[PDB]
Amino acid sequence: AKKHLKRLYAPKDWMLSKLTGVFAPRPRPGPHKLRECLPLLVIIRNRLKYALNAREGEMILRQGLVHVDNHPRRDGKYPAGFMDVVEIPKTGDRFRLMYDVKGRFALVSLSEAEAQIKLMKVVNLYTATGRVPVAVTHDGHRIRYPDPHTSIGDTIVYNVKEKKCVDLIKNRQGKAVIVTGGANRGRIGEIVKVECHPGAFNIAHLKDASGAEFATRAANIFVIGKDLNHLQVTVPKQQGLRMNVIQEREERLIAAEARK
Amino acid sequence: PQYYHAHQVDATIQHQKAYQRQTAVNENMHRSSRKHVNKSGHIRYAKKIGLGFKTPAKALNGKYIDRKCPFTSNVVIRGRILRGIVHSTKMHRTIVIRRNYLHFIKKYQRYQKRHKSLAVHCSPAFDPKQGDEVVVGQCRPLSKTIRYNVLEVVSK
Amino acid sequence: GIVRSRLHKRKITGGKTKIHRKRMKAELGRLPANTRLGARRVSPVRARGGNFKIRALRLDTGNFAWASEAIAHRVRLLDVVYNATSNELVRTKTLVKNCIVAVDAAPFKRWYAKHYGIDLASPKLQREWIRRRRNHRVEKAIADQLREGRVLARITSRPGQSGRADGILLEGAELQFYLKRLE
Amino acid sequence: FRLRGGSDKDGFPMVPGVLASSRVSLLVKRGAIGFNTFRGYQGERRRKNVRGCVLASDIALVNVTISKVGDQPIEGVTDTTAPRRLGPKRASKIRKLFNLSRTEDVRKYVVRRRVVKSGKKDRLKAPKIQRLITPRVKARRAKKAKDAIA
RNA sequence: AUCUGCGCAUGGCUCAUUACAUCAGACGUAAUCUGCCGCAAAAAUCUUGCGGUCCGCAAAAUUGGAUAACUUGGCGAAACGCCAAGCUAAUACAUGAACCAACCGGGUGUCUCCAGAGACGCCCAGCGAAUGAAUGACAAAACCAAUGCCUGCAGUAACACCCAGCAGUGUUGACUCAAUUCAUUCCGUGCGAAAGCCGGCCCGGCGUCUUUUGACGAACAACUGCCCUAUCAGCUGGUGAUGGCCGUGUAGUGGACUGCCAUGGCGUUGACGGGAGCGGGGGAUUAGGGUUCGAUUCCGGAGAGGGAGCCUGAGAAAUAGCUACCACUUCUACGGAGGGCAGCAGGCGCGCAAAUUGCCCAAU
């Protein structure tokens, strides 16, 4: 039973500096994976500067002031990951955890109507006791009576206030996804062709808005809308478009010279 | 009219001091459904394993009673699917396959003949001779050395 | 203690394995139950996860199923008749899985008079007996030992694992298999 | 006299049951007669030297309790009595003490126990009495039946 | 202060062991256990009160016994040693909830009907578990019996009313699985609405059984890979070596193990035995090819003086846990009682060879 993380064995997307202490806050089991989450001490202290250390950081959390998906989370080690909605009523800001196109976690600011729904991907389907078919989700939810057209690769729109699955997005050819793993993580694209290969990993071929073709495993894609215009959720400021490394290097030198 | 006339003992398969039966299905049903009964006569359990492997003519219409068999048991084929050539068939219902490969040495820019031998459980659906090329699928441990189980035999 | 590892087994080359750890608790085994006939005495065993595994010592009764009729009846074990592992386990009358036992046969006859109405007259209103009994027939080797008093049967549960002596009645070629080995 | 305890010239107890006249070596569990439950961890079977129950000359102490009183009163044990230190705390166990009715209130029949200190405006210590089901508790308990069916 | 609830299985040190082992990349667990945490689930149980001797009328179920701390008396040279008695708690332990309060199903005896249909009565019908059976799909007319609508067959989900669509449709590459139906019965080794606690002015925070699954893990299996040695060429198999059949044991698979049968398996593509010693990420040098080092911060494995064996727990074969022996070893009032720095400071040795018996939780 591990209870510690070393700050070197912590994920790189958290961006904790190696010289500040040996340890990182090991996220508890919960909704999201340990490799694939951002625990609430890092959001309150390192992302947002509401807390200067971990001692000011539990003055916020243990008091019941941060809400992940409409419910107050008093754990600094609670795993918040992809598509979660983090509200704070006192400062009046609410955010969504999305991946930006460089693969890192990004806090997308939200309205009040956009902060009620979240988008969740089915990971398993089974029948529970009774004859109730429940749907297992990447965020750990077990929706008991989902839309009967739910398959495993699909996306359920959820509305975390009134816990009612308001919508369904099937996983087909004509849909748009966001990639949540691999080298292509954070990129958004239309689906082109899904190569099955039964017994092994499904490969999904994807085309971007510019036309850049790229592939991933189909367990890494997360469908978020009917097309790239009609996305069901708002995405970070690049909107899944990965610029060239040369062109994005030129633009920062131009912006820094034009600023002085 | 009250008497049923059940099936007689098939001594060709019954050799083994306990009665050889399949645990999946009951042999003794009076009005057995069309679920598991095969073409000619008797009740049989046959299963379709995964990866586009066609079950043989035996294991559906055969008479043998095999546990540890991928087509007629709870043995599931999963993980690795490999190929080898049959080396020895001297064991009872088990063959040893030989996997011959070239090992490249990065220093001396030249390959090197190596081999791995695997004990593979062989169903009575199959009779492979030495030199036959087989396709094996990984299963659970079935003995001290058996992890694989033959799925298809390619003759000669 | 008792271990279930391959550290003591020789390699397939015949080489000895040199041991560089202590025994783990996660690789243990325990002493066998050796369940016999007798009045019921069980001892639970604390397994992994805190689950309980009920050792059966001295069992005398179980739920035996008659699979053509898809019913079961709690009957009393009489004798241990044939065991495929050893004839020495018959003599000490050990209950294991798949050993052949004789059971009481009285609830099976009484059920066969209550259902199908055949003895080995009182509800004249309900002859749903006639709705059955026409298509169905009963194997002769069952009906002989059913009225003889004891029925040969096969244990289908693991008593040292579950603390139960459940079973099935021998039918078909399986009964005719074991009748030849006895007599 | 009921012989029910003992010790040696070395402080080792006389465990009732072992039927020896010597000191013997037992793997006593925790909470047994030779090994207290706070000294150890939860599994914790510790081996102690305890002494037999058969009495002998090498005994420095025997614990006895009287089951019947004889003639001579000349002893400080049967001539006096000392009060029980604590009255009852459970609400239904303090109701049986004074043989109260069902409708009767229990808060008036609590023991006083004055505490007096020199020049301190002395005071009373009463138990916070447990298992007393107020109407606020009755509404709380009847709500769990309503919301389990709802 | 003590009961109670979690934790002490992590961290930290060290690198002695160790070559079909460990370990790396990559897979498997459909062969399995899994506390804390996340989202869920939940209709079993003839209990109380009052009166009468088993019944009646009632209903916010106002349940029961014991221990600590403490007091008293203490034993003992002591001991992170102990005894006896007297008190008293619970979210400890034990007991236990009728009706409100459903649907659905099986087996079965009287009663109104017709030439089989209904009403009533009784036994049984909860989650989990065992065994057995059934599902867990599929890929032109003629005549007789029962039965369907028509006034002979147009057209048709299924079903004798209560509900005229209240599942004819689980998932996987694949299941003997998920789940459902009925047959039998679980005897403590499961299932309270904690018989729980706060707060606001009915409602809101918690806290807990069971059940179930994601998550953090555990355990096993092995695809490819690995220093030198032939002055090491045969290794294994009675007492398991390779396989097969029933079992057993396990958390589970399995020669892991009992019985029985077969005669196998490994090797000059270097087995077997011997020597060196944790394995990677990585370091040093390098045009290219390389040659070396890796006790050491991160990951994994192993150990706690050697060697066992256990308890408890979700997880240990735990060592600032227990039991024993061996080698050393400390206190004794000789009766006895203890030790385990490869934790951090230090100490003595050993060596060519490595620091402060320091301050602090301010940060991680």
Ligand SMILES: NC[C@@H]1O[C@H](O[C@H]2[C@@H](O)[C@H](O[C@@H]3[C@@H](O)[C@H](N)C[C@H](N)[C@H]3O[C@H]3O[C@H](CO)[C@@H](O)[C@H](O)[C@H]3N)O[C@@H]2CO)[C@H](N)[C@@H](O)[C@@H]1O
């Ligand atoms: N060789 C390991 C295995 O031991 C098994 O048999 C072993 C046992 O019969 C027996 O082992 C016993 C053991 O049962 C018992 N419970 C404990 C005892 N220490 C062991 O004894 C063995 O070990 C010790 C120390 O090494 C030796 O002194 C002793 O001579 C040796 N026979 O001796 C045999 C080993 O020499 C099987 N033969 C086989 O599985 C395999 O040989």
Ligand SMILES: [Mg+2]
């Ligand atoms: Mg405690």
Ligand SMILES: [Mg+2]
């Ligand atoms: Mg090396």
Ligand SMILES: [Mg+2]
């Ligand atoms: Mg077996």
Ligand SMILES: [Mg+2]
């Ligand atoms: Mg380490």
Ligand SMILES: [Mg+2]
């Ligand atoms: Mg020694």
Ligand SMILES: [Mg+2]
């Ligand atoms: Mg030191």
